[PDB]
Amino acid sequence: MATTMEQEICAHSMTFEECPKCSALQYRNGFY
Ligand SMILES: [Zn+2]
């Protein structure tokens, strides 16, 4: 695998760069 796919795959449901969005979804999803 080598941690590589490219298609929004975070420990939440997004991409590395979008990892900070997993919580910051401006919703009840997360806050920080
Ligand atoms: Zn994430």
Swiss-Prot record:
Coiled coil: none annotated. RNA binds at C22. It comes from the Viruses. A zinc finger (unnamed) spans 10-22. Phosphorylated. Forms a complex with host RAN and probably binds to exportins carrying activated MAPK in order to mediate the hyperphosphorylation of host Phe/Gly containing nuclear pore proteins (Nups) resulting in cessation of active nucleocytoplasmic transport. Proteins with NLS signals fail to import, cellular mRNAs fail to export, and some proteins small enough for diffusion are not retained anymore (efflux). The resulting inhibition of cellular protein synthesis serves to ensure maximal viral gene expression and to evade host immune response. Interacts with host RAN; the complex L-RAN recruits cellular kinases responsible for the L-induced nucleocytoplasmic trafficking inhibition. Interacts with the protein 2A. This is Leader protein. It comes from Mengo encephalomyocarditis virus (strain 37A).
